[PDB]
């Protein structure tokens, strides 16, 4: 019965990642004054199915890897960590209702850089390894502002419990007291997922260009699971919805609409901006977001004390 709950979590994750690709191609079509896919299915609804069947019977590139074992373990780790970030998500009830769900998510997203690192070293190209090291350095850079923005917000929560974050936002959204944290958080989640304007794995060859089309589709679907997940986590964190404990589907519809609009905001940002040069997003992290994030971390430490609004522990 619990395994039914695990499958009703993880199989709709795979379906929503399948159709996020279609939604991205359609929304980027209409924002680029064209259509998206509308031939393959009715309104293109069979485009992800056709494309998945195409990729799973495409020939393997059959490369020379330094490690066979890390070449197998990098997609396994990417998919496993992409699926374990969902299990504490309170929507309105988490699958695993853990007391440190925020810190668990922060740790399991910190572990996601080994997929990039192991897949880069598993490729024998030195250029793929250099691009992998640039992607890892970008990601661990933006993890700093993830951790500190998240800490500064949870100073208003009182605990690392994700389910308490619904109770925190019953009177107001937490984007009202923490909109600078919210906007730096949103750009930091944009830079965690190698998402445009921070997609330097498509700027002129990434880390996973040496895989077959099947494992490349697995990396791709882990990345889009991370995108949908970080939008849901941002929605829980700043745009927390109303919850009737006798009608949980009201909260589910509300956070689902907000998370869809936030994922479409990711799609709409990649359809609007040029890329950063690599040192420019290093400049954006280390010289712009991190001083503001430390200043607001001091502010959200000292502000519940000066207003007498320290939240409860329990």
């Amino acid at each position: 019965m619990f395994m039914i709950n695990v499958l009703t979590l993880i199989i709709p994750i795979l379906l929503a990642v399948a159709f996020l690709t279609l939604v991205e191609r359609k929304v980027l079509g209409y924002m680029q004054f064209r259509k998206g896919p509308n031939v393959v299915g009715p309104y293109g609804l069979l485009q992800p199915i056709a494309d998945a069947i195409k990729l799973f019977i495409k020939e393997p590139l059959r490369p020379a890897t330094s490690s066979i074992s890390m070449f197998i373990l990098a997609p396994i780790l990417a998919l496993t960590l992409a699926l374990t970030m969902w299990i504490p998500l309170p929507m309105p009830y988490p699958l695993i209702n853990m007391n440190l769900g925020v810190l668990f998510m922060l740790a399991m997203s910190s572990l996601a850089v080994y997929s990039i690192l192991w897949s880069g070293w598993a490729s024998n190209s030195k250029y793929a390894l250099i691009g992998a090291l640039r992607a890892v350095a970008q990601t661990i850079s933006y993890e700093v502002t993830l951790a500190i923005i998240l800490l500064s917000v949870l100073l208003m929560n009182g605990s690392f419990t994700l389910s308490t974050l619904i109770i925190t936002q019953e009177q107001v959204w937490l984007i009202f007291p923490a909109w600078p944290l919210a906007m730096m958080w949103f750009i930091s989640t944009l830079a965690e997922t190698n998402r445009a304007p921070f997609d330097l794995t498509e700027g002129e060859s990434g880390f996973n260009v040496e895989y077959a089309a099947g494992p490349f589709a697995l990396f791709f679907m882990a990345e889009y699971a991370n995108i949908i997940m970080m939008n849901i986590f941002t929605t829980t964190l700043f745009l927390g919805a109303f919850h009737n404990p006798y009608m949980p589907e009201l909260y589910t519809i509300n956070f689902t609409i907000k998370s869809l609009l936030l994922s479409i905001t990711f799609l709409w940002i990649r359809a609007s901006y040029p890329r950063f040069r690599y040192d420019q997003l290093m400049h954006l992290l280390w010289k712009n977001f991190l001083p503001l994030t430390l200043a607001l971390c001091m502010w959200h430490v000292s502000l519940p004390i000066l207003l007498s609004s320290i939240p409860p522990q329990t």
């Binding site: 191609r25 079509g29 680029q32 004054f33 064209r34 259509k35 998206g36 896919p37 509308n38 031939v39 393959v40 293109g44 069979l46 485009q47 199915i49 056709a50 494309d51 069947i53 195409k54 019977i57 495409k58 020939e59 393997p60 590139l61 060859s205 260009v209 040496e210 077959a212 089309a213 490349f216």
Partner: protein, 156 residues
């Protein structure tokens, strides 16, 4: 028999999925690149057919040779074609890719890209219009639709 029916339905499935998700690697060699970009432009929009805009060469399904193949770039074309995973296809766009074209008698031009790679669709024009190139891509999809891989495998 029953196995004949199963390989017929499975060939129909895999051919549907391969033709309905063609990913092109376009060689922007010469003027035909501009008309490929018009076949990607919002009037014609290859992406509504599932034909994405600028897939990377290690994951592409068709190689659209759009422009003049000179002798100095013939091994680069061959190397990219060798790096493409199967089933790979090659569309020859325009007269210089087809038969050398206006530079057929030149000292420096490969007389048609068919001397270097096997070619599936020859799209004629100088340049062929973006509608004519889209016609050639739909004819390539019809060529993939009538492939008989598992049926010939079941008969071999």
């Amino acid at each position: 028999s029953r196995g004949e029916y199963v390989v017929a339905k499975l060939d129909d499935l895999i051919n549907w999925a391969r033709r309905s998700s063609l990913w092109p690697m376009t060689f922007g060699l010469a003027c035909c690149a501009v008309e490929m970009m018009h076949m990607a432009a919002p009037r014609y929009d290859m992406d509504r057919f599932g034909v994405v805009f600028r897939a990377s060469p290690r994951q592409s399904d068709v190689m659209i040779v759009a422009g003049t193949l000179t002798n100095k770039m013939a091994p680069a074309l061959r190397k990219v074609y060798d790096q493409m995973p199967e089933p790979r296809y090659v569309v020859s766009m325009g007269s210089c890719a087809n038969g050398g074209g206006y530079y057929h008698y030149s000292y420096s031009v490969v007389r048609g890209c068919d001397r270097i790679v096997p070619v599936d669709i020859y799209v004629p024009g100088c340049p062929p219009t973006a509608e004519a190139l889209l016609y050639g891509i739909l004819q390539l999809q019809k060529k993939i639709k009538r492939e008989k891989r598992l049926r010939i495998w079941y008969r071999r």
